[model samples]
Target chain A: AKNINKSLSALGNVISALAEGTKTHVPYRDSKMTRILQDSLDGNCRTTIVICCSPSVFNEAETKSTLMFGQRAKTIKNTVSVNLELTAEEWKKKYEKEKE
Target chain B: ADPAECSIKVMCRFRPLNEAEILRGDKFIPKFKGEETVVIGQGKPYVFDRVLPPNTTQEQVYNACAKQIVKDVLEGYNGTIFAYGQTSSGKTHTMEGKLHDPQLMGIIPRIAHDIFDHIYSMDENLEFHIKVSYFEIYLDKIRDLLDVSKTNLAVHEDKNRVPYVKGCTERFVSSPEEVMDVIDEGKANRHVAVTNMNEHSSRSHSIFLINIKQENVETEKKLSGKLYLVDLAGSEKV
Candidate 1:
C-alpha cells in the first residue's frame, strides 16, 4: 500500500516540477501521467494555477493555506528564451551571450 | 437600430456555499434585486445581462450565458468565453466538470456537445474537423498542457495584426467523446497545490483553445471557426 502511494506521488512531483523548476528533479519515467505531461510542464512551457476558497471564517485555516500556495507559485519565473531574444534594444548583449 | 453587430456580453453566477461556509452559517449578504441586478455587501448595486442565484440550474445558466456564443461560433464567428471569479467560486466547476457527471459538466464540454449536435442535423456533405489545445500562463509563462516538451512558445501577430500563440499542441477530435478525453487529460495535468480551502487549487490562468474547420465535400470548400475557453485565476487575492 505504501509503495502504491509513493508511485502515485511520483506522478505529482513530476507535474509540480514545472513551478519548482530545474531545482527539482522531474521523474517523468515514474508514471504515465508524468510521462504524458512531460512536455507541458517543462521549463519551456508557460503555466498558471488558480486557488479556490470561501469567504467564511470557519474555513480560515484552509483559506490561508490556499492563498499561501498561490503566493509561492507567483515566484516562479519562466524564461521565454531560446529564440528571438533580440529587441530594438539589447541586441549587442544578446549577440555577445549567443556568441559566447 | 437595425440588425447590427452585438457588442460583448457579461453574466454573473452564484454557487452554493462550501462546507466551511455552511458550518459557520455564513449567508451571502447580497441579493439579486432583479434578473439583471445584484446587491453585494453594502447599498451599491451592480447590474449585468444576467444574475444567476445559487439555485440557478446548469441548463438555465448555459442558456443565458453561453448558448448564443456557441451558436455564433458554429456559424463562423470568432467567440471567446472567459470565466473570471474568486477561487472556489465555481470558475473551474463552470468551465470543466467532473467526468461523466452530468451536473458537474461545465460549459466547455457542453459547448463541444452542442457544436457536434448542430453538425449532426446538417447536410451529409458538411463535416467538421476540430483541433483543441490547452495551455496555462503560470507566473506569466505559457505552458502547453497537451505537449509539455514544446515550450517557450512565442506570441506573435499575423499580417492582419491578429494575435496567436505559436508552438502549442493541437489535438484533432471528431466526436464529443474525443473532446472530453482531451479535456480530462489537460485537467489532470493542471498545476495543483494543496491549500487550506481546496486540495486541487490551480495557481494559474488556463486557456483551452478550439478551432473548427468545416469542409463541404461536394463543393470542396472549407470554413474555420475558433473558440477560446479561459479559466482565469482569482483576481486581487493573488
Candidate 2:
C-alpha cells in the first residue's frame, strides 16, 4: 500500500501540473489507474477520493504515508468538462479534413 | 466541422401562478421581451442569454435549451441541466414533472425519451449501455438517494480531477420505464419539508446522473456520455 501511495503521488504531481496550465504531454497514456480514473472521472463530475487508513499506533509509518498522499492530492486541481467522442464516421471525416 | 460551443449560458424562465397565487391575485409579472431582456422590480434591466415567458411549456423550454444537448449525448458529449429558483417556483416542475401524466412530463423524462429514440434512429452496429446513480447533498453532506444505507458519501476527484461520489449504487437501466422508476425511487428518499414557501419543499440538492456508454460492435471503440439533472433547493435560509 505504501508503494502504491508513492507512485500515485507522482501521477498526482503530473496531473496537478497539467491542471496548473502546462501544455506538455501527460505521461499517463500507458497506465492502468489513469485509464480507470479517466473512464469514470473524465467529465462533468466532481471527483472526490477518500484515503482510508487505520489509526493503529503500531503502523504509524503506513498511516503517515497515507496522510502524505492525501496532502499531495489536495493540492492537485483539475477542470472537469463534458467528455465527448466522435463516431467512427465522424472521426474519419474529421481526420480527413485535418489532413487537407 | 464541429461548431464552436459556448462554455457558459444563462437563461430566465417564469412559471405561471399557482391556484393559491391566482386566488390571491399575485402580481409577480415577469415581462420577457423576445430574445432581448426583462424587467422585474424597480424597472431594473436584467439581461440573460435567453428569456421565456410564464406561458412557456415544458416542451418548448426543453427544445430550446436541452433538446440539442440530449442529441449531443448520442454522439458522446455530456450535458447538465440544473433548475434553480426561489421557493414555490417551478424548479421541481421543470425538472421532474407530474410522473403520471405523459403530457405533463418534465425535461428529465423527456430527455430519457429523446435519448432512446435518437439512439434507435442511429446506426444499427452500435451497442449502448445506460446506467443511473442518484444522490442528494444536504447541509453539504452527500447521501446516496438510491440506497438508503449509503450515507455521507465523499466526493473525490479522480486521477483526472473530475468529481465522483464513492459508495453510491449505480443500476443498469434498459428502458425508459426502468430509468424513470429509479428516478422516482430516488425522489421518494429526498429530504423534503413543509415550509411557508412550499408544502413539500426539498431542503437538499438532488442530483441524478445518467451514464451512457456506447461501443462500436466490430471495432470495439468506446464512448461515454453523462447527463446530470439537478433540482437545487429553493432560495430559503439554511
Candidate 3:
C-alpha cells in the first residue's frame, strides 16, 4: 500500500538522522510508528534491535540492506533510566491534595 | 537513579537456508568471523553487538539477547526488543516460534515465563499486577489485535509523556499460560497474508506489550515497568 510505503520511508529517514547524529530535527512525528516510538527511540529506555537475515546467496541484495540497516542502528546512543510509577491510589491521593 | 548512557544494541541473526533455497542450490553467503563480526562473500565485514550463526537455537538466541532485558524490566526498567529484516528472513520465526512447544518457544513466551517465574519467587508481601496489550500497525493504521472489532486506535500520551494506545484493551494475566492464551488470541487476529516470498508472511508490525506493577503492601511503595516485544513486518520490494 502507498501509505505503508510512505511510512516506512519516513522511518528510514528517522533512522538515518539518528545514525548520522547531525540533523537537529529527527522527524519522529513523520509517521505513526515513529510517533509511538518517540519515547523509546529518543532515550530513557533500554532497546535491542535484532536484525534477521537469510544466509542464501539468492537473497543477497536484501540481506546486505538489512546488514547495513543494522550497522547504522549500532551508532545511535540512548540514555536509559528505570521507569517507576506511582500506584493508582497514590496518584489519586496526590491529585486530591494538589486540588486543595 | 541517574540515567545510564549506552548505544542501542544491534545484533544480527542468520537463518539457515530453507528447504526451498536448498533445493534451488542457494549458497550460504555469510561467514562468521567470530561472535561479533560477519563477512559476506568478498564484501566488507559487518560488526554487531552480537552475531548469531544459522545453527543457533531459539533458546540460545533468547539467552544471548533477551534474558538481560527481561531481568532489567523486572527491576523496574522499560525495555524493548524488536526483530527486523526482509520478508521470510525469520523475524516472526525468531519472535514467535511454534508457541505450543516449550522446547521451541520464542522470545515472547520465554519472557512471559521468566516474568511469572520471578513473580512467583518474590516475597508474598510484594503484590504484583501484570497487564498485556497486543496491537499491530497495518498500512499506517493501528488495530487492536486482542479485539479485531476495535480498529483505527489512536496513540495518546500519559501525564508522564509516555505514548499509549487510547481505548485499547488490556488483559490482566497472572500466569505464563494465561499470557500465552492472550498471545494466541491476538495472533489469530494478526494480519498475515501469503506473499511471493513466503506462505504466511506477516503484513503488519505486531507489538506485544507487558506492563508490570509491584507494590510493597506494608510500605505502600510501588514500581512499574513495561516490556515491549515487537515482531516487525519484513521489508520487501513492492
Candidate 4:
C-alpha cells in the first residue's frame, strides 16, 4: 500500500512513485490525491470508493490536482457499484455500531 | 353586471380550541365548549363535530393532514404534503413509509401512485410524466442527497443541483409495483442521518419534488405542477 499524507508535497511523492512503477495503489503518479486518498475510494477490499473533496483555499492546488486525478481515474472504466450515503443522523447511529 | 358576484369564496379555516388558558392554545387546539359557531354569511353556523383528542400522536396529525393534501392532488389540485415534528416523532415512518404492504404506505409516494392512476384513466389520450428530485439542506446549506462530495452545499446555501428522476425510464414498471422499484431507487439516492432517534433520521428537509404533468384531451386542458413532500430535520427536543 502507498503512503498517505496531508501535504501536497507528499502527494507529489506518491505521483512520482506510482509513475515509476514503484506502486500499484490505485492512482499512480497521476497527480491529485484521488488515487493516493484511498481511505474512502479504492479500498481494494470490496471496491466502493467515495472521494470527499475540500474546497479550502489553502489546499487549492491539491484540490485541483485531486479533481484532475479523479477525472482521469473515472475514465479508466471500472464498473463497480456503490450505495448512496444515508441520512446524517442515520449514519451517526450506525457509524460506531453502539460502541460496545 | 353586478359588482362581480361572489359565486365561490375561498375561505381558510383552522382547528379551533376551547379553554381560557390550559395548553388549549396549541397548534392543535381543542374545541371550546358552548362557543357559538360562526356562520359563513347566509349559511348556518359551521361547527366541528369533534376536535381530535389531545393525545393524538404527532404521526396521526401529520397523516391526516397529508391524507387531505393527497386527496386534492389525486383529484387534480396541486398540493404540497409534509411532516414537521420533533425528533423520534416518527416523521420518516409517517412520510416515505416502509416497503410494500398498505400498512406501510405513507402519504408521499402513495399520493403519487394515486394521482397517476386517477389521471391515467381520466385522460386516455393525455400523456403524463412524473419526475423526482432529492436533496438536503444541512446547517442551512444545500447538498445532493445522491452525490457525496466535499462539494457539499455552501455553509448556508445549496448549489441547487436538484436531480430530476424520470419514472418513465423505470423499465419493467408496467404497473404500480414497478413504480415502487423506481421509488426505491431514488430512496437509495437519498441522504440519511442516524441519530439516537432513528436509523436514518433526516438531518435536513429532504425535499422530494414530484413533478406532475398531465393532459386532458376530453377537456383539452394541459396542466402541470410540482408536488413537494417535505420530511424536515428533526429537532433534538428529545
- Whole-model lDDT values for every prediction: 0.58, 0.59, 0.82, 0.39
lDDT for each residue of candidate 3 in A1-100, tens digit (9 for 90 to 100)? 2323555566667778988886578887777777777666676778899999999989898888789888987888888777666668987888999899
Taking all chains together, the TM-score of candidate 3 against the true structure is: 0.90
Q: Give the C-alpha lDDT of model 3.
A: 0.82
Error of 1 at A57 (Å): 9.8
- Per-residue accuracy of model 1 over B1-238 as CA lDDT, tens digit each: 1222232354666667777778778865446687966554554565556667778766677677778867666665556665554556677777775646777677788887888888788779877788998876644456787766644565654433445577888999888898888878876665333143243244456678888777777755555656777776554232
Q: Which of the predicted structures, 2 or 3, would earn the higher DockQ when compared with the native?
A: 3
Tens-digit lDDT track of model 1 for A1-100: 1212232344335434544655455586564333333323343222333233444454444434434344444344433221111243456665777799
lDDT of 3 at A55: 93
lDDT of 4 by residue, B126-226 (tens): 66666555555444444555453422443221122222322212132234555566567656654334234243444455656555555655544555554
Clashes of each: 25, 13, 0, 18
Best by DockQ: 3
Model 4 / residue B93 / CA error / Å: 2.2
For all candidates in order, state the fraction of native interface contacts they contain.
0.04, 0.06, 0.79, 0.00
The i-RMS of candidate 1 is 13.8
Sorting all predicted structures by DockQ, with the top scorer first, yields: 3, 2, 1, 4
lDDT of 3 by residue, B84-132 (tens): 8877899988888988678888899989888987788887779888999
Best by TM-score: 3
Tens digits of per-residue lDDT, candidate 4, A18-95, equal 334445653422422222132112221111111122222333333234333323322221112121224476556667
Q: What pairs collide in candidate 3?
A: none
Q: TM-scores for all candidates?
A: 0.65, 0.67, 0.90, 0.43
